[PDB]
Each structure stands twice: as structure tokens, then as C-alpha cells.
Amino acid sequence: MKAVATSPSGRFLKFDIELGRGAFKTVYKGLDTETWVEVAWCELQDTKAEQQRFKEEAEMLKGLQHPNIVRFYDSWESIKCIVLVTELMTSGTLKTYLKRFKVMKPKVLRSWCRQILKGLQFLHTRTPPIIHRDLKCDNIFITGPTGSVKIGDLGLATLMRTSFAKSVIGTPEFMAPEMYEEHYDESVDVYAFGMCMLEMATSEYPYSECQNAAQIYRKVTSGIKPASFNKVTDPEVKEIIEGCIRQNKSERLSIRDLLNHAFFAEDTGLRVE
Numbered sequence: 001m002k003a004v005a006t007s008p009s010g011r012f013l014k015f016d017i018e019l020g021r022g023a024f025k026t027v028y029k030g031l032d033t034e035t036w037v038e039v040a041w042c043e044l045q046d047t048k049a050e051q052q053r054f055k056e057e058a059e060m061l062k063g064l065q066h067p068n069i070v071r072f073y074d075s076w077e078s079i080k081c082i083v084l085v086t087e088l089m090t091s092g093t094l095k096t097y098l099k100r101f102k103v104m105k106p107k108v109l110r111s112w113c114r115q116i117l118k119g120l121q122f123l124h125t126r127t128p129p130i131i132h133r134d135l136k137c138d139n140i141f142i143t144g145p146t147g148s149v150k151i152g153d154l155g156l157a158t159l160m161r162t163s164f165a166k167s168v169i170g171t172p173e174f175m176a177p178e179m180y181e182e183h184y185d186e187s188v189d190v191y192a193f194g195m196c197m198l199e200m201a202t203s204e205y206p207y208s209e210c211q212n213a214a215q216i217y218r219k220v221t222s223g224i225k226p227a228s229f230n231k232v233t234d235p236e237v238k239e240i241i242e243g244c245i246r247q248n249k250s251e252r253l254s255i256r257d258l259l260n261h262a263f264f265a266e267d268t269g270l271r272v273e
């Protein structure tokens with residue numbers, strides 16, 4: 001198996017083995033010549049100010065270390081495309097887990113949600129803060145051993161140097177209504193986490209009844225909840241989801257409110273008043 005590309009630092013190789021393909025990202029099999037452990041050689045679809053901004057953001061993502069965040073090895077612009085090297089995750093995501101077991105056990109849902117919340121609190125407390133802008137169950141990877149989860153797919157993330165981000169990107173099912181207004185903050189990762197928790201409690205894509213991305217845009221910007229919202233059996237999970245997907249960003253719960261919620265700590269014994 002001869003390698004077909006090499007990272008600029010000379011550390012990572014690319015193999016012509018496609019593992020997955022999405023709307024803008026193709027996952028190849030890569031190798032870390034320092035350790036000979038395989039990595040993920042991901043290739044994404046690509047002014048000078050944005051190019052210089054890109055070099056600084058990659059250097060900060062390159063320095064992140066947190067047990068609930070996939071390691072960001074390197075990234076650069078190639079020849080028309082953006083290469084992104086991260087950990088080759090091989091235990092499946094929370095989407096493949098939901099697509100397999102259909103029902104997620106309540107204790108499993110809370111344990112993984114708390115780790116996701118700790119992963120989001122890490123990005124939001126960086127200097128400058130980092131918005132994921134693409135949180136969903138397929139960007140949350142199960143890690144061995146002990147089955148801890150890490151947030152990955154930082155290809156759409158931004159460092160918050162100003163007060164607000166503007167670019168309208170992400171996955172429509174998980175995008176906050178103010179994202180289409182080109183003026184939003186880190187509250188969109190809470191909104192997407194509300195849809196992640198909705199996906200884990202219903203085991204389907206939110207707004208699956210919509211025909212395309214425009215219908216999702218029309219419903220969300222009108223303050224209409226997805227049809228799977230009223231299918232949530234656990235009232236505690238339903239109220240938390242409602243507290244995250246609120247149409248007004250200023251009314252939504254915060255990460256600290258979620259991390260301190262009495263729901264994510266009920267696995268200490270019986271449910272008592």
C-alpha cells in the first residue's frame with residue numbers, strides 16, 4: 001500500500017482508501033509516521049485575509065486537548081481543497097448507534113450528553129471562544145475504551161474574535177434560526193445540542209417530515225418545532241429540548257444551566273421529589 005500524499009510537516013501520509021463521503025468532506029485513511037497509528041485524512045471543499053485567518057485558526061485547533069474533543073492534528077489548503085487530519089474514529093457515531101439500537105437507554109443518554117456538554121463548555125471557554133457550528137449525533141464519536149464520546153468534525157468551526165459570526169453554513173436540521181440572519185453567537189451550539197438530545201430521544205433526524213432544506217428553513221425561522229418533538233416520552237428530556245431550541249437565543253438555557261440540570265444527575269438512585 002503505497003502512500004499518495006504527505007502533510008506539509010511530513011508527519012502524516014494519505015492512502016487512497018475512501019472510508020466515507022458527505023456533503024463537503026471525504027474521509028481517507030491516513031497514517032501517523034511518528035507513531036504508525038492510523039489517522040483520518042479528511043479532504044473538504046475549500047481571500048488573503050481569510051487565508052491568513054485560516055492559518056491562525058488551524059494553529060489554535062492544533063493546540064486543543066480535551067477528553068471530549070477529537071484531536072485536531074493538522075489542516076491546510078492543498079494545491080483547491082482543505083485537508084484536515086484528525087483521529088480515525090472506528091466505534092461509530094451517536095447516529096450509527098441510534099440507527100442500530102433504535103432506543104438509547106436513559107442512563108446512556110445522560111452520561112453521553114454530559115460529556116458533550118463538557119466538550120461544548122471547553123470550546124466556548126477557549127481564548128478566543130470556538131463555535132462548533134456543526135453539532136449533531138454523527139459528529140459525536142464513541143471512543144474506546146469505556147465508551148466515552150468526543151465531539152469531532154471541526155471543519156466548520158470558527159474562533160470568535162468579534163462579537164458575532166455571520167456565515168450561513170452547517171446542517172439545516174441543526175441550525176439555529178438566527179444563523180440565516182447572518183448574526184449569531186455560541187448559542188447555536190446549544191440549539192444544535194437540543195436537536196442532538198432530540199435525536200437521541202426519538203432516534204430520527206429532526207424535521208424528517210420536511211421535503212428539503214428550504215422547508216426546514218421556513219419552519220425554524222417561523223418558530224415551528226419539528227414534528228418529532230411531541231414524540232418525546234420523557235417529559236424531562238422534552239423540557240430540556242424546548243429550553244435549547246427556543247426561537248429567541250436570549251431565552252435559551254446555557255451550557256452551565258444544562259450541566260447543572262437535575263436531569264443529568266438522576267443516576268444516583270431512585271427518582272424522589
Ligand SMILES: Nc1ncnc2c1ncn2[C@@H]1O[C@H](COP(=O)(O)OP(=O)(O)NP(=O)(O)O)[C@@H](O)[C@H]1O
Pocket residue numbers: 019020021022023024025026027040086087088089090134138139152153170171
Ligand atoms: N474522523 C472520522 N473518523 C472516521 N470516520 C469518519 C470521521 N469523520 C467522518 N467519518 C465518516 O465519514 C462519513 C462522511 O463524513 P461526514 O462528516 O458526514 O461528511 P460531511 O456530510 O460533508 N460533514 P457533516 O456535516 O458532519 O455530515 C460520516 O458519516 C462518518 O461515518
Ligand SMILES: [Mg+2]
Pocket residue numbers: 021022023138
Ligand atoms: Mg454527513
Ligand SMILES: [Mg+2]
Pocket residue numbers: 138139153
Ligand atoms: Mg461529520
